[PDB]
Design a protein around this nucleic acid. Structure first.
Ligand SMILES: Nc1ncnc2c1ncn2[C@H]1C[C@H](O)[C@@H](COP(=O)(O)OP(=O)(O)OP(=O)(O)O)O1
Ligand SMILES: [Ca+2]
Ligand SMILES: [Ca+2]
Ligand SMILES: [Ca+2]
Length: 341
DNA sequence: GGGGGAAGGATTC
DNA sequence: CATGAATCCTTCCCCC
């Protein structure tokens, strides 16, 4: 089995560079403006010119301007990036019918029956980078290995605008030298739990009784890491379909007033329904972000589909339930629809 | 005991 | 200061 992972470089900002080439070379910061005070919000992503100085995804726009006050700041345009992404995704289909689209800018290709070895896979890589660079003017990093995880790790090491292969020989090496934290699916919270257990590299997970592992990070995460350490991880490439659709907005100011909140909530439902387009949900959840960045939610599944009318009234109750069951103020309110018919 | 779904949350990218 | 969706976990609950 041979996997080829494609990851587009600094995607949102690169698409803005493509649409306005006079930007290539200058630090570009794509942000989400919360409408609260001035320049309130966060950075969705930034090109590398900007990342050299610490401006990256997740930091306040405010801290970014303090560092790069003259950089170009642009408001995120998700719809545009999505259509550009869809076109690139369609180009990849012509290289394998077995393709897994993991996110707006990541995709795994199962190229076992289109190639015989790593030389041809690597070659197919350059061919794909070029096809995309020509047709869309988007540079992408490619990763190639025996399974999805290592394909992705490969790209993580080769980005930006790179390509790298991790042969079986190097796979066994990494399982021993690679920092467990660099393994996809291992975030700051799990990496921490892993250190207290003394597990610092993939291999280390073998010198520990599975039961203590399952207890600390869960069974799923345990079997996952153990199979990667044993080098028997071989999850297939599957076409994934939406199981959920929703939206959450930020308020001008925190609140607990049902009447002051409703507008934002209804706005979220209107936009969610628009995205459902033909899909009908049997379940709805109202999600709130408390004044201290905590997340609470109340839901309800119905035996039948939900009409926009029902959604509107039901969401109000679930919101009231949240207020009744939590004294804190709400910072962000929103809805989520799932269990489509 | 244990299947199976539902609800609220934890984590990750 | 702090802007969509998947997968997994724990606890309930109904029930044969
Ligand atoms: N914190 C975030 N907030 C909003 N969107 C995000 C965030 N992190 C990532 N994204 C989105 C927008 C990015 O362009 C896209 C690509 O995934 P990402 O992990 O960030 O790849 P990257 O390291 O190559 O840079 P880039 O973010 O520009 O693509 O995912
Ligand atoms: Ca990515
Ligand atoms: Ca990317
Ligand atoms: Ca990590």
């Amino acid at each position: 089995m041979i996997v080829l992972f494609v990851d587009f470089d600094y995607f949102y900002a690169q698409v803005e560079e493509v649409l306005n080439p006079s930007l290539k070379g200058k630090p570009v910061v794509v942000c989400v403006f919360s409408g609260r005070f001035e320049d309130s919000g966060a950075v969705a992503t930034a090109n590398y010119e900007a990342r050299k100085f610490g401006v990256k995804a997740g930091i306040p726009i405010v801290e970014a301007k303090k560092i790069l006050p003259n950089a170009v700041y642009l408001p995120m345009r998700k719809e545009v990036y999505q259509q550009v992404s869809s076109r690139i995704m369609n180009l990849l289909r012509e290289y394998s019918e077995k393709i897994e689209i993991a996110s707006i800018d990541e995709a795994y290709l199962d190229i076992s029956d289109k190639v015989r070895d790593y030389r041809e896979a690597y070659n197919l890589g350059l061919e794909i980078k070029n096809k995309i660079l020509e047709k869309e003017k988007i540079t992408v990093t490619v990763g190639i290995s025996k399974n999805k995880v290592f394909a992705k790790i490969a790209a993580d090491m080769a980005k930006p605008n790179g390509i790298k292969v991790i042969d079986d020989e190097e796979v066994k090496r990494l399982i021993r030298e690679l920092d467990i934290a660099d393994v996809p699916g291992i975030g700051n919270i799990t990496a921490e739990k892993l250190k207290k257990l003394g597990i610092n590299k993939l291999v280390d997970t073998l010198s520990i009784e599975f039961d203590k592992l399952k207890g600390m990070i869960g069974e799923a995460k345990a079997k996952y890491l153990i199979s990667l350490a044993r080098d028997e991880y071989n999850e297939p490439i599957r076409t994934r379909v939406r199981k959920s659709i929703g939206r959450i907005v930020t308020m001008k100011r925190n609140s607990r007033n049902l009447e002051e909140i409703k507008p934002y909530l209804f706005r979220a439902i209107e936009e969610s329904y628009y995205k459902l387009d033909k899909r009908i949900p049997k379940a709805i959840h109202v999600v709130a972000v408390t004044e201290d960045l905590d997340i609470v939610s109340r839901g309800r599944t119905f035996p039948h589909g939900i009409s926009k009318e029902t959604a509107y009234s039901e969401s109000v109750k679930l919101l009231q339930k949240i207020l009744e069951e939590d004294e804190r103020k709400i910072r962000r309110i929103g809805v989520r629809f799932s269990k489509f018919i």
